[PDB]
């Protein structure tokens with residue numbers, strides 16, 4: 093009745109969000125993906141295909157120069173005078189990939205240019221006009237006009253009535269339940285900011301009702317020692333059903349009711365909540381007076397607190413905690429102090445999460461002072477504001493304000509943070525929030541964000557508690573996306589469903605059968621591509637028209653992953669090679685890759701390029717997805733065995749020399765290793781990945797090292813080498829059997845990198861904190877964050893930290909560590 097109304101009110105606000113995004117505005121409705129940029133605080137050759145010319149013009153561009161001027165550098169090559177050529181209309185796209193470079197960004201900024209530079213591959217672009225550019229994903233006029241398909245009052249603070257409700261009954265219990273369990277009981281808890289207000293109240297233990305084995309009837313009144321006036325707005329009642337077995341009691345399912353609804357009215361009368369195991373209806377009867385109780389916020393306190401009495405004596409302790417890594421591990425006496433001297437910290441905005449976490453309580457009286465500070469507070473950094481969207485800050489005024497600061501973030505930065513933002517929706521108790529409107533707004537204005545949100549929300553649906561919420565959010569995204577986007581995403585969904593069929597069919601056969609099974613199973617995929625051309629879900633810029641069945645294969649390892657080879661719909665493009673894996677939960681692989689990618693962004697933003705391999709991985713359902721295949725790369729295992737057949741101190745060295753024969757070619761390959769290895773060693777330690785052996789590490793022919801398996805992750809239960817540097821690796825780093833200055837470089841890079849991540853301890857702890865609700869196996873507790881914080885040693889300075897990591901490296905070498913110098 094009220095939840096149907098909430099859904100109605102949601103849709104109408106989404107209908108008026110759509111108004112800000114007309115189909116005519118190309119800015120927000122391009123119809124194509126924008127090639128991503130990562131601002132990085134140098135010459136390259138680019139090869140541009142131009143309409144009319146038989147050969148593409150190849151010239152050297154300044155990496156620093158903007159795409160706009162490179163477009164008319166290319167126009168200067170064809171036209172002696174570019175005054176009648178309508179320079180504005182022309183754009184630059186990557187050859188093969190239906191992604192357009194951003195005109196007002198440096199060429200060096202673009203991820204594609206960065207990648208090409210790393211691999212030393214050719215930058216192939218195409219100069220064209222947006223007329224010729226494919227805009228099939230663009231929204232239409234139809235899409236714009238289309239609708240979205242997914243009495244007397246007492247104010248709360250006066251209400252002295254006690255929070256009580258009678259748990260009445262659960263309906264529709266299963267046959268295997270009445271079999272197993274003898275009696276059932278509910279545990280009722282009341283929380284705000286994700287923390288209990290009072291200890292949970294347990295119900296009486298009751299069997300199924302007489303002459304009705306589908307029903308459990310308690311009909312018991314539960315009374316909490318709290319008045320209605322003491323309840324914060326975002327108060328939530330949790331009910332967990334337990335069942336004591338016949339002949340510890342087991343948690344059958346959870347339910348959460350918000351005590352205040354979306355129009356600030358206290359829940360009255362009978363409320364039905366549905367817990368999933370199978371749909372069980374649980375009835376809770378709240379009191380039902382002749383009057384509606386509404387929540388009203390505290391009266392606005394208007395103050396501008398300016399110059400104040402200052403002391404030196406305590407200012408030092410103040411700036412000590414201001415410049416603390418995070419609000420994690422902050423003791424009681426530290427909080428009371430900061431809270432007292434909060435108005436002095438007005439010149440350091442990024443420490444507001446530290447201040448709000450130091451608040452004595454969120455009592456109605458103490459809110460006017462909190463809101464007074466908040467609405468005179470300077471803007472936070474988007475990445476800092478993330479903390480305010482976590483569980484421990486449920487207040488709407490905090491969250492709404494966190495999202496307003498968040499609006500300052502770029503699409504390109506947001507795109508890689510979306511998993512955390514999707515999880516953050518679980519801490520929004522109301523469907524229609526500032527956060528969901530923010531996400532939907534960005535999705536409308538950027539097709540990469542919309543595309544990413546789709547897959548993330550579709551994975552989130554599998555949450556038994558929050559699956560209902562995400563259903564409405566994804567319905568809003570798909571509706572608002574338009575027919576163009578929808579029809580394309582449908583094709584992508586069908587492709588993965590087909591690739592999924594063959595994947596499990598392949599694994600379910602014998603050795604002989606496997607190769608024939610694949611060739612036969614792929615016929616149904618061949619059929620798909622004859623009636624449609626599909627964009628690759630992993631990288632939707634690539635459009636596959638046909639499958640190269642003769643090139644398709646399986647990787648002979650334990651899940652028997654597929655090697656799907658599709659031919660590009662663009663002849664200027666290159667063949668599409670992706671792996672489709674089934675069985676393994678690729679979400680923790682996704683997180684590891686994300687964390688490593690963010691480490692890379694941090695490093696690059698401080699001018700440290702460790703030449704990291706950053707490959708994609710997408711979960712396209714439960715325990716299945718596709719992984720980007722890095723070309724001309726093998727595992728250290730295969731390298732070690734193939735060149736142990738032919739010495740046994742230099743198998744990697746002689747592998748790199750095979751593909752890099754000249755002195756300068758081997759030099760650049762050895763150098764690539766040094767940098768990439770340093771980055772891997774740092775990442776291995778900080779994220780705690782102790783399953784790093786010859787199979788789990790991979791090496792590109794260009795010299796770049798990278799991890800592939802992330803089964804062990806946040807496993808900081810290690811006995812006192814985190815990472816391993818074998819004699820093979822050391823030989824490549826040194827360029828010899830005796831230590832050189834190249835090892836000093838490796839050690840310098842490691843420590844320098846380590847420290848740049850230590851500087852962003854807060855970000856990493858926030859990013860890992862927000863992924864705890866995901867259900868990833870290692871990430872289950874805040875304690876699991878402490879392990880990462882301990883690895884980052886925020887207490888120590890860069891001097892001591894360098895000494896620590898340098899001792900990690902000396903330990904890493906192990907037996908052969910004797911040869912090097914302390």
Ligand SMILES: O=C(CSc1nc2nccnc2c(=O)n1CCc1ccccc1)Nc1nccs1
Pocket residue numbers: 647648649669707719720721722723724725726727790800
């Ligand atoms: O050349 C390769 C590299 S093999 C690989 N690359 C990866 N790249 C990124 C992430 N994960 C992996 C990965 O798991 N493997 C397979 C690991 C393996 C190795 C030997 C036996 C069983 C399993 N791919 C191709 N590009 C074009 C054609 S083929």
